[PDB]
Design an enzyme around this catalytic site. Structure first.
Site, PDB file in Angstrom:
ATOM      1  CB  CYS A 121      58.444   9.465  18.256  1.00 19.06           C
ATOM      2  SG  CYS A 121      58.611   8.340  19.648  1.00 19.06           S
ATOM      3  NE  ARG A 168      61.406   8.609  15.485  1.00 23.86           N
ATOM      4  CZ  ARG A 168      61.759   9.114  14.398  1.00 23.86           C
ATOM      5  NH1 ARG A 168      61.809   8.369  13.056  1.00 23.86           N
ATOM      6  NH2 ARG A 168      62.421  10.251  14.322  1.00 23.86           N
ATOM      7  CD1 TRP A 179      59.552   6.343  28.951  1.00 22.13           C
ATOM      8  CD2 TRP A 179      59.200   3.849  28.826  1.00 22.13           C
ATOM      9  NE1 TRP A 179      60.779   5.748  28.364  1.00 22.13           N
ATOM     10  CE2 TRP A 179      60.537   4.315  28.372  1.00 22.13           C
ATOM     11  CE3 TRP A 179      58.907   2.661  28.616  1.00 22.13           C
ATOM     12  CZ2 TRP A 179      61.318   3.391  27.711  1.00 22.13           C
ATOM     13  CZ3 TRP A 179      59.753   1.773  28.048  1.00 22.13           C
ATOM     14  CH2 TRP A 179      60.877   1.967  27.412  1.00 22.13           C
TER      15      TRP A 179
HETATM   16  C1  HEM Z   1      58.798   4.347  25.058  1.00 24.91           C
HETATM   17  C2  HEM Z   1      58.639   5.473  25.352  1.00 24.91           C
HETATM   18  C3  HEM Z   1      58.294   6.816  24.541  1.00 24.91           C
HETATM   19  C4  HEM Z   1      58.537   7.919  24.838  1.00 24.91           C
HETATM   20  C5  HEM Z   1      59.795   8.437  25.741  1.00 24.91           C
HETATM   21  C6  HEM Z   1      58.246   8.810  23.504  1.00 24.91           C
HETATM   22  C7  HEM Z   1      58.565  10.134  23.581  1.00 24.91           C
HETATM   23  C8  HEM Z   1      57.794  11.130  22.700  1.00 24.91           C
HETATM   24  C9  HEM Z   1      57.772  12.528  22.976  1.00 24.91           C
HETATM   25  C10 HEM Z   1      58.186  13.242  23.967  1.00 24.91           C
HETATM   26  C11 HEM Z   1      56.801  12.951  21.885  1.00 24.91           C
HETATM   27  C12 HEM Z   1      56.458  14.579  21.738  1.00 24.91           C
HETATM   28  C13 HEM Z   1      55.023  14.536  22.084  1.00 24.91           C
HETATM   29  C14 HEM Z   1      54.682  15.866  22.304  1.00 24.91           C
HETATM   30  O1  HEM Z   1      55.387  16.833  22.669  1.00 24.91           O
HETATM   31  O2  HEM Z   1      53.366  16.278  22.533  1.00 24.91           O
HETATM   32  C15 HEM Z   1      56.627  11.874  21.131  1.00 24.91           C
HETATM   33  C16 HEM Z   1      55.766  11.978  19.784  1.00 24.91           C
HETATM   34  C17 HEM Z   1      55.129  10.893  19.299  1.00 24.91           C
HETATM   35  N1  HEM Z   1      55.519   9.669  19.706  1.00 24.91           N
HETATM   36 FE1  HEM Z   1      56.652   8.987  21.058  1.00 24.91          FE
HETATM   37  N2  HEM Z   1      57.407   8.119  22.734  1.00 24.91           N
HETATM   38  C18 HEM Z   1      57.524   6.845  23.280  1.00 24.91           C
HETATM   39  C19 HEM Z   1      56.832   5.821  22.809  1.00 24.91           C
HETATM   40  C20 HEM Z   1      56.012   5.917  21.490  1.00 24.91           C
HETATM   41  C21 HEM Z   1      55.103   4.731  20.941  1.00 24.91           C
HETATM   42  C22 HEM Z   1      55.213   3.432  21.683  1.00 24.91           C
HETATM   43  C23 HEM Z   1      54.544   5.411  20.104  1.00 24.91           C
HETATM   44  C24 HEM Z   1      53.796   4.538  19.042  1.00 24.91           C
HETATM   45  C25 HEM Z   1      53.869   3.236  18.814  1.00 24.91           C
HETATM   46  C26 HEM Z   1      55.057   6.595  19.450  1.00 24.91           C
HETATM   47  C27 HEM Z   1      54.620   7.369  18.836  1.00 24.91           C
HETATM   48  C28 HEM Z   1      54.756   8.847  18.856  1.00 24.91           C
HETATM   49  C29 HEM Z   1      54.076   9.809  17.995  1.00 24.91           C
HETATM   50  C30 HEM Z   1      53.151   9.315  16.751  1.00 24.91           C
HETATM   51  C31 HEM Z   1      54.217  10.936  18.179  1.00 24.91           C
HETATM   52  C32 HEM Z   1      53.825  12.051  17.544  1.00 24.91           C
HETATM   53  C33 HEM Z   1      52.129  12.655  17.765  1.00 24.91           C
HETATM   54  C34 HEM Z   1      51.953  13.985  17.326  1.00 24.91           C
HETATM   55  O3  HEM Z   1      52.344  14.210  15.822  1.00 24.91           O
HETATM   56  O4  HEM Z   1      51.366  14.502  17.803  1.00 24.91           O
HETATM   57  N3  HEM Z   1      55.934   7.176  20.787  1.00 24.91           N
HETATM   58  N4  HEM Z   1      57.171  10.806  21.511  1.00 24.91           N
HETATM   59  C1  LIG Z   2      51.538  18.698  22.489  1.00 26.65           C
HETATM   60  N1  LIG Z   2      50.864  17.967  21.459  1.00 26.65           N
HETATM   61  C2  LIG Z   2      49.712  18.045  21.450  1.00 26.65           C
HETATM   62  C3  LIG Z   2      48.957  17.784  19.921  1.00 26.65           C
HETATM   63  C4  LIG Z   2      48.666  16.043  19.689  1.00 26.65           C
HETATM   64  C5  LIG Z   2      47.452  15.799  19.329  1.00 26.65           C
HETATM   65  C6  LIG Z   2      47.323  14.407  18.995  1.00 26.65           C
HETATM   66  C7  LIG Z   2      48.295  13.524  19.451  1.00 26.65           C
HETATM   67  C8  LIG Z   2      49.456  13.932  20.200  1.00 26.65           C
HETATM   68  O1  LIG Z   2      50.531  13.305  20.656  1.00 26.65           O
HETATM   69  C9  LIG Z   2      51.688  13.539  21.456  1.00 26.65           C
HETATM   70  C10 LIG Z   2      52.395  12.314  21.638  1.00 26.65           C
HETATM   71  C11 LIG Z   2      52.247  11.167  21.116  1.00 26.65           C
HETATM   72  C12 LIG Z   2      52.514   9.808  21.448  1.00 26.65           C
HETATM   73  C13 LIG Z   2      53.448   9.758  22.566  1.00 26.65           C
HETATM   74  C14 LIG Z   2      53.820   8.669  23.222  1.00 26.65           C
HETATM   75  C15 LIG Z   2      54.633   8.812  24.004  1.00 26.65           C
HETATM   76  C16 LIG Z   2      54.976   9.801  24.799  1.00 26.65           C
HETATM   77  N2  LIG Z   2      55.591   9.595  25.991  1.00 26.65           N
HETATM   78  N3  LIG Z   2      54.526  11.051  24.525  1.00 26.65           N
HETATM   79  C17 LIG Z   2      53.529  11.040  23.465  1.00 26.65           C
HETATM   80  C18 LIG Z   2      53.220  12.188  23.031  1.00 26.65           C
HETATM   81  C19 LIG Z   2      49.662  15.143  20.465  1.00 26.65           C
END
Ligand code: HEM
Ligand SMILES: CNCCc1cccc(OCc2ccc3ccc(N)nc3c2)c1
Ligand code: HEM
Ligand SMILES: CNCCc1cccc(OCc2ccc3ccc(N)nc3c2)c1
Ligand SMILES: C[C@H](O)[C@H](O)[C@H]1CNc2nc(N)[nH]c(=O)c2N1
Ligand SMILES: C[C@H](O)[C@H](O)[C@H]1CNc2nc(N)[nH]c(=O)c2N1
Ligand SMILES: [Cl-]
Ligand SMILES: [Cl-]
Lengths: 362, 362
Positions: free
Chosen positions: A65, A68, A237
């Site tokens: 993420c 963070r 967001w």
């Molecule tokens: C506040 C604005 C936030 C932004 C801009 C942001 C941005 C991102 C982005 C761009 C990703 C990559 C996701 C992808 O490419 O599919 C991501 C992954 C992630 N974010 Fe954030 N995030 C935010 C808030 C949060 C919050 C509030 C949480 C949890 C409390 C969180 C937990 C995660 C987790 C767990 C992933 C990984 C999910 C996975 O392995 O698929 N994020 N975030």
């Molecule tokens: C593109 N990856 C898809 C595979 C996958 C499966 C389950 C969860 C997942 O999360 C991506 C993810 C998780 C948390 C987020 C929080 C904020 C944000 N802007 N994007 C976020 C994007 C992603």
């Protein structure tokens, strides 16, 4: 046996949590009570304070993420009291409304009762609370292909999508003891959507693209001190590239680049023209322009990376190791223009944290 | 002791090499002779055939290289006969001329005598045979910062750069038994350069950018069957992004994005405008346009990735495991538009291969 696993994860978490809370003296006693509750019951119950802080730690420890920096301001809604499917529905509905906040998105997580014996009390089938349906039959492709299997699962259960490219999927979740999930159509008054326009190419509206305002990931498990919150949807967001460079761009998603190239008036005939690249940049400018213009929160990948740099600095000052997944932290457009691309990150998993779990459809 | 290390690397390599050559029967005997030569001398000598094939295997096993489809057509020049600094100079000069081929670049490697006891016979100080000098003094920054330390090393040795932003560094290398290296100015007739223009923004020439035609990496060690060819410069042709997205773009290199933004007539004031991204795309279109227009080989990152996909397919058909470094294989612009971004790669090191070695300056 597994009271062992629970106890250690519990010890590790309470120590760190109370430490961070300035409550180190209260540990010896809090661990006492937990040690008893585990022996007698097989489990333990987090105070509201512990749960709030653990959810925040979990976001902090999410290697993938980029957002963070703001971990400590996560809005935590403790819904461990729900018992009925009407309560779950209503909690999910409320999460959407409060997180959306008329466009000024509040990072929020709603936390439902945890697994008991490994037995789920509530099982959410949605990948995000707001997501578009997807269809494929007879060479006909409609909507978001990523949603095909859940969409077919809903239509088994008596739901029927209008088959636009932007059908909102219903909320769908199962309660402990029910063999089948229930589904509830989203009230359209709750869901903000943003039409995609370009700041200076008027023809861009011809693509008739849109996306929803708030991504609310509802299929990961939150783990805090050995307690498994399999149903704990959260949101931030959007970063623009998630919409403009993947959801709308990927060949296996909405696959709009050829269409973008045409409306921006460049040819899509030669690789050496970099027309995909030029299309990506304009689609991405359009997404940021559209969200900002509607007053719906969004961040661009540069600002995001600047924020993450401060998260890195802040980790250091606090004495905490930084962990990260470079392959997910770099943005998918102009990654080398961010500091992220030019350093390495340790990808160790630290708990508390959010984890993948098996889908119950497919 | 280390005759052990040599023997195993030798066994492993000859087996595989003769196998690939259709010469499996000749192995038992070739290993015999080697086994003797190692015992008696401490080392062994590769036939021209073995060396050619090993250099090619080395390119094949380079995890970070997107251009591996063409490994089997590498042009191998065996210069193990050189003894004098005039011969080394003349071999380096010839490599430049033959690889350049009037713009129709031939992937070529020139192979110099290997290390003996770990004792180098020839030590090349250049990072590439053609590279621009770099200066920093009194807040004054000229040329390519990546070259600052080698540039200062040359100027110790009596060389003096004109202090343009594109001074060609001299060839500089040391011979076994000389305490100091020698340097030789590059004949400008040998070095093709390409002025950067844009296919439709005429003002782009105002930036007065240029780059050299052929990147000839001259500081890595080739290792083949336990023999260490520390001096073995090689080249391909450029992928446009290496020039347009890094050499000219990186803040620590030529740092031209603000200047690009101005000539293409967009503001460089707000992150949400994605002006860096738009600048990157136009600079990169300009680089491809310029090379193609001058008749100097170059490949764009899409075509490159399509080629690498065929390399992957070809590996599979041949029964060979594929190894790769995803973090270097993805291009630095629009990476998610390539198949590379969407799969994983095993980053194991397989020999033969090219390796980093310690710089003798700094
Ligand atoms: C506040 C604005 C936030 C932004 C801009 C942001 C941005 C991102 C982005 C761009 C990703 C990559 C996701 C992808 O490419 O599919 C991501 C992954 C992630 N974010 Fe954030 N995030 C935010 C808030 C949060 C919050 C509030 C949480 C949890 C409390 C969180 C937990 C995660 C987790 C767990 C992933 C990984 C999910 C996975 O392995 O698929 N994020 N975030
Ligand atoms: C593109 N990856 C898809 C595979 C996958 C499966 C389950 C969860 C997942 O999360 C991506 C993810 C998780 C948390 C987020 C929080 C904020 C944000 N802007 N994007 C976020 C994007 C992603
Ligand atoms: C024919 C055209 C070729 C193209 C387009 C190509 C492309 C590339 C690119 C883009 C990189 C990444 C470099 C960077 O980002 O700094 C790379 C790395 C590399 N290439 Fe190739 N390459 C080609 C030919 C060759 C040849 C002929 C060899 C050797 C015989 C080679 C060996 C390597 C090695 C060893 C690396 C990694 C160097 C390191 O770790 O720093 N390539 N290649
Ligand atoms: C940007 N990386 C610089 C660090 C470094 C140090 C030593 C060698 C090196 O090689 C990059 C490299 C190597 C071989 C190449 C062959 C062809 C090509 N187009 N680019 C190529 C680029 C790179
Ligand atoms: C390994 C670490 O991620 C590091 O930043 C890498 C990333 N990929 C790279 N890619 C290229 N082309 N050049 C580099 O110098 C690096 N550095
Ligand atoms: C790990 C492997 O490199 C894989 O392709 C990853 C790359 N990074 C990613 N990044 C995002 N945002 N989404 C993905 O699905 C993936 N997949
Ligand atoms: Cl999303
Ligand atoms: Cl280079």
């Amino acid at each position: 046996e597994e009271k062992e696993i629970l106890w250690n994860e519990a010890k590790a978490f309470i120590a760190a949590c109370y430490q961070e809370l300035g409550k180190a003296a209260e540990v010896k006693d809090r661990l006492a009570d937990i040690k008893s509750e585990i022996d007698l019951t097989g489990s333990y119950v987090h105070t509201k304070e512990e749960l709030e802080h653990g959810a925040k730690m979990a976001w902090r420890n999410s290697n993938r993420c980029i957002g963070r920096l703001f971990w400590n301001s996560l809005n935590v809604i403790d819904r461990r009291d729900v018992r009925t499917k009407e309560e779950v529905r209503d909690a999910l509905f409320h999460h959407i409304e409060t997180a959306t906040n008329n466009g000024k998105i509040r990072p929020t997580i709603t936390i439902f009762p945890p697994e008991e014996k490994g037995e789920k009390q509530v099982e959410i089938w949605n990948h995000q609370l707001i997501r578009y349906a997807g269809y494929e039959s007879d060479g006909e492709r409609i909507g978001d292909p990523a949603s095909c299997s859940l969409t077919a699962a809903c239509e088994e259960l008596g739901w029927r999508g209008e088959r636009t490219d932007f059908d909102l999927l219903p909320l769908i979740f199962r309660m402990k003891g029910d063999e089948q999930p229930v589904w509830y159509e989203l009230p359209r008054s709750l869901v903000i959507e943003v039409p995609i326009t370009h700041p200076d190419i008027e023809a861009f509206s011809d693509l008739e693209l849109k996306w929803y305002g708030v991504p609310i990931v509802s299929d990961m498990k939150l783990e805090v001190g050995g307690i498994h919150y399999n149903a704990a949807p959260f949101n931030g967001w959007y970063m623009g590239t998630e919409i403009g460079a993947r959801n709308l761009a990927d060949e296996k998603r909405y696959d709009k680049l050829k269409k973008v190239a045409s409306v921006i008036g460049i040819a899509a005939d030669y690789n050496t023209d970099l027309w995909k690249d030029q299309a990506l940049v304009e689609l991405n400018k359009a997404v940021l322009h559209s969200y900002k213009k509607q007053g719906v929160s969004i961040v661009d990948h540069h600002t995001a990376a600047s924020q993450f740099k401060r998260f890195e600095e802040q980790a250091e000052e606090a004495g905490r190791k930084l962990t990260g997944d470079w392959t997910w932290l770099i943005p998918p457009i102009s990654p080398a223009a961010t500091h992220i691309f030019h350093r390495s990150y340790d990808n160790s998993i630290v708990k508390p944290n959010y984890f993948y779990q098996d889908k119950p459809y497919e």
